[PDB]
Amino acid sequence: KRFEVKKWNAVALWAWDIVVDNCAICRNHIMDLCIECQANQASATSEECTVAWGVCNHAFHFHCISRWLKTRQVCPLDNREWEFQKYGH
Amino acid sequence: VYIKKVEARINEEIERVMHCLDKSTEEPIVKVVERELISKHMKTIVEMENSGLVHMLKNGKTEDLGCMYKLFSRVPNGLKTMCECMSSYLREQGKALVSEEGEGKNPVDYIQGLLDLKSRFDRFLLESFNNDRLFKQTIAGDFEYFLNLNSRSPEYLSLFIDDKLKKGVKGLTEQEVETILDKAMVLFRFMQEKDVFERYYKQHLARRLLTNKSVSDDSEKNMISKLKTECGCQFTSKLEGMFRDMSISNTTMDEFRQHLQATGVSLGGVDLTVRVLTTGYWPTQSATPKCNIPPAPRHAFEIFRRFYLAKHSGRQLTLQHHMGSADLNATTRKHILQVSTFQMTILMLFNNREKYTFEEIQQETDIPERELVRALQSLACGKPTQRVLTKEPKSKEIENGHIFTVNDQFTSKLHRVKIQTVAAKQGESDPERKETRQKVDDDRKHEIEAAIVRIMKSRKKMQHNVLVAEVTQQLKARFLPSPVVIKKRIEGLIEREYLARTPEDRKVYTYVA
Amino acid sequence: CGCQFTSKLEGMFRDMSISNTTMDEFRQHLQATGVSLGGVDLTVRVLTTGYWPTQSATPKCNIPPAPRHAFEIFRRF
Ligand SMILES: [Zn+2]
Ligand SMILES: [Zn+2]
Ligand SMILES: [Zn+2]
């Protein structure tokens, strides 16, 4: 051949157990509202309900994980302490 | 020359009064002499014209500043107007320097000029004002006032620090590097809007750590130490966390090389410099540009993903193309090219069959839109005399039916020639600026909510505007209070539980979870 | 002698150790690369300039084709 690839320096991304099909807290979906929002428009003003990402790469609704901060907050999908590393999918 | 003459007059008057008159004889005499000379010359001799205070400071007369400071210090309200005029000159210079009208300014040059001005003023202060507290306070206030004016200055500061950190070609030794870093952090001290600064610093970290390594290998510790004595223990922690992610990545590279060697040295993944990062730390939320992976890299990526998915159970290795690089071995000598995972698919298609066009590279490859145009322009348009992908229809704009060819270009004197079309002159186009502004706005909007739910759970209640002052004071060192934004956002949580903060029943708030 | 030159002696012994580690790792990586058949039975060694008196390491001469390919593969790795 005329051009042959010798080295490749790709970067791989990964997530723990985000479950796109279902919030592990609310069991609706990774998107499309939560159990305590229901109607998408209602009185939301651009739907403040977003997706919360922690240092443990686990994804839930920001509303879903905000209700669990009051009591024990141990990211119930693992033993890591839940943080807030990214907002929005 | 008036200051020297009046100083000589004061000296001769005091000598005469102490030698030719009684023993004390000096308090009313010197007081009235000062009140007549300085209190009358103070208003007009420093501002009117013809080398007053502003001109004698612009040209850099150290002796004039020193003698003026040592003379006006005796009379009250002299340092006040001195610092007022100095601050006025500083505002004028900053407005002449922070001017936004006009495109085509170099951010690194702008930050270098600002740092040079700051260093010049600090040297003048040290040499003349004898480190007076009032002058330092006035210059600090002036810097806070004219630097916070622009909201794009933090971005230029981040670009300057990235330029200084990428390679220490200027100032090989460490003393001048340390001094320039201290000056940079001092300049950043009198700066607001730290959120955009941190965001752009993290973006620069991602750019410099996901590219060719061995930039400094030691200055990262100095940077994080300075950021812990300036920002604190907030996002500097996430920075060192993604550095640890890089560490984990290299451990994975060596362990996967060992595993491949045990299961038959992977020929497809001969030099698989694959990297593993987390979504939360690095801003890789846009890691889904599904496009055909070249046969050998496809198999290599599949093998790496299978090894990783098993190693750490649950490792969904998403595929992406907008990161990394590669070394293409071309072949009269064998010169190795370089592709930043953008031209790999087009070059592989050319290897499979030459004489392609835009339709061929847009039909049978499943390519995105903007990145396609960017990569095509980088490979074809705006190329110096080292072209690796030539075309017959020589034109600036991109057509559809244009055939692509290849040129030898023996101008490369080594075997490792790279096409570094990316990371060009800092343009900061409107779409990227708008998207990063929206991202930082959402970041602030969630940060304020996090603060209000972390603080107010252990504090008292507000009636009309009591707790908003506290929440703005806690965020005074972060960014602007934005009263309308916080007022519109605090009333959005009333729709559900956890301190709904009922507006009609504002007498008491629900101190529950 | 003491500890004047014995340390450098054991240092060049460690250089030999590093060299044999390099031989085995390059043999392992040879099957991965192997651009041509030039990289066959390779017994390459890696030493440091300071330890061994190899300051005269610039005989610029041509290499046979199979050794040429082997040296190119080793240099690329
Ligand atoms: Zn949920
Ligand atoms: Zn919700
Ligand atoms: Zn977790």
UniProtKB/Swiss-Prot annotation, chain A:
Residues reported to bind Zn(2+) 2: C34, C37, C49, H63
Q: Which GO terms describe its biological process?
A: cellular response to amino acid stimulus; cellular response to chemical stress; cellular response to oxidative stress; cellular response to UV; DNA damage response; MAPK cascade; negative regulation of canonical Wnt signaling pathway; negative regulation of insulin receptor signaling pathway
Binding-site residues for Zn(2+) 3, renumbered to this chain = C56, H58, C75, D78
Look up the record and report any one GO term of the cellular component aspect: cullin-RING ubiquitin ligase complex
Q: Where in the cell is it found?
A: Cytoplasm; Nucleus
What result follows from mutating C37A? Strong reduction in ligase activity
Tissues showing expression: Widely expressed.
Q: What is its EC number?
A: 2.3.2.27, 2.3.2.32
Q: Which family does it belong to?
A: Belongs to the RING-box family.
Q: How does it assemble?
A: Component of multiple Cul1-RING E3 ubiquitin-protein ligase complexes commonly known as SCF (SKP1-CUL1-F-box) complexes, consisting of CUL1, SKP1, RBX1 and a variable F-box domain-containing protein. Part of a SCF(SKP2) complex consisting of CUL1, RBX1, SKP1 and SKP2. Part of a SCF(FBXO3) complex consisting of CUL1, FBXO3, RBX1 and SKP1; this complex interacts with PML via FBXO3. Component of the SCF(Cyclin F) complex consisting of CUL1, RBX1, SKP1 and CCNF. Identified in a SCF E3 ubiquitin ligase complex together with HINT1 and CDC34. (Microbial infection) Interacts with human adenovirus 5 protein E1A; this interaction inhibits RBX1-CUL1-dependent elongation reaction of ubiquitin chains by the SCF(FBW7) complex.
Name the record gives this protein: E3 ubiquitin-protein ligase RBX1
UniProtKB/Swiss-Prot annotation, chain B:
Give the UniProt subcellular location, in the record's own words.
Nucleus; Golgi apparatus; Cell projection, Cilium, Flagellum; Cytoplasm, Cytoskeleton, Spindle
Q: Mark out the compositionally biased spans (Basic and acidic residues).
A: 427-443
Superkingdom of the organism of origin: Eukaryota
Main localization category: nucleus
- Give the record's keywords alphabetically: Acetylation, Autism spectrum disorder, Cell cycle, Cell division, Cell projection, Cilium, Cilium biogenesis/degradation, Cytoplasm, Cytoskeleton, Disease variant, Epilepsy, ER-Golgi transport, Flagellum, Golgi apparatus, Intellectual disability, Isopeptide bond, Mitosis, Nucleus, Phosphoprotein, Transport, Ubl conjugation, Ubl conjugation pathway
Region (Disordered) residue spans? 422-443
Cullin neddylation domain residues are 443-505
Concerning PTM, the database record says: Neddylated. Attachment of NEDD8 is required for the E3 ubiquitin-protein ligase activity of the BCR complex. Deneddylated via its interaction with the COP9 signalosome (CSN) complex.
Q: Where is this cross-link: Glycyl lysine isopeptide (Lys-Gly) (interchain with G-Cter in NEDD8)?
A: K457
Gene Ontology molecular function terms on file: cyclin binding; identical protein binding; Notch binding; POZ domain binding; ubiquitin ligase complex scaffold activity; ubiquitin protein ligase activity; ubiquitin protein ligase binding
* Extra remark beyond the main annotation: High-glucose conditions in renal tubular epithelial cells lead to up-regulation of CUL3 expression, significant increase in CUL3-mediated ubiquitination of MRPL12 and dysregulation of mitochondrial biosynthesis.
So what does this one do? Core component of multiple cullin-RING-based BCR (BTB-CUL3-RBX1) E3 ubiquitin-protein ligase complexes which mediate the ubiquitination and subsequent proteasomal degradation of target proteins. BCR complexes and ARIH1 collaborate in tandem to mediate ubiquitination of target proteins. As a scaffold protein may contribute to catalysis through positioning of the substrate and the ubiquitin-conjugating enzyme.
Instruction: Give the protein family.
Output: Belongs to the cullin family.
Q: What is this protein called?
A: Cullin-3
Organism listed in the record: Homo sapiens
UniProtKB/Swiss-Prot annotation, chain C:
Q: Where is it made, tissue-wise?
A: Brain, spermatozoa, and testis (at protein level). Widely expressed.
Q: According to the lineage, what is the superkingdom?
A: Eukaryota
Q: For this protein, what post-translational modification is recorded in UniProt?
A: Neddylated. Attachment of NEDD8 is required for the E3 ubiquitin-protein ligase activity of the BCR complex. Deneddylated via its interaction with the COP9 signalosome (CSN) complex.
Localization recorded for this chain is:
Nucleus; Golgi apparatus; Cell projection, Cilium, Flagellum; Cytoplasm, Cytoskeleton, Spindle
Functionally, this protein is described as follows: Core component of multiple cullin-RING-based BCR (BTB-CUL3-RBX1) E3 ubiquitin-protein ligase complexes which mediate the ubiquitination and subsequent proteasomal degradation of target proteins. BCR complexes and ARIH1 collaborate in tandem to mediate ubiquitination of target proteins. As a scaffold protein may contribute to catalysis through positioning of the substrate and the ubiquitin-conjugating enzyme.
Q: How does it assemble?
A: Forms neddylation-dependent homodimers. Component of multiple BCR (BTB-CUL3-RBX1) E3 ubiquitin-protein ligase complexes formed of CUL3, RBX1 and a variable BTB domain-containing protein acting as both, adapter to cullin and substrate recognition subunit. The BCR complex may be active as a heterodimeric complex, in which NEDD8, covalently attached to one CUL3 molecule, binds to the C-terminus of a second CUL3 molecule. Interacts with RBX1, RNF7, CYCE and TIP120A/CAND1. Part of the BCR(SPOP) containing SPOP, and of BCR containing homodimeric SPOPL or the heterodimer formed by SPOP and SPOPL.
Similarity section: Belongs to the cullin family.
Q: Which disease is it linked to?
A: Pseudohypoaldosteronism 2E: An autosomal dominant disorder characterized by severe hypertension, hyperkalemia, hyperchloremia, hyperchloremic metabolic acidosis, and correction of physiologic abnormalities by thiazide diuretics.
Q: What is this protein called?
A: Cullin-3
Its gene? CUL3
Portion of the full sequence shown: 462 to 538 of 768
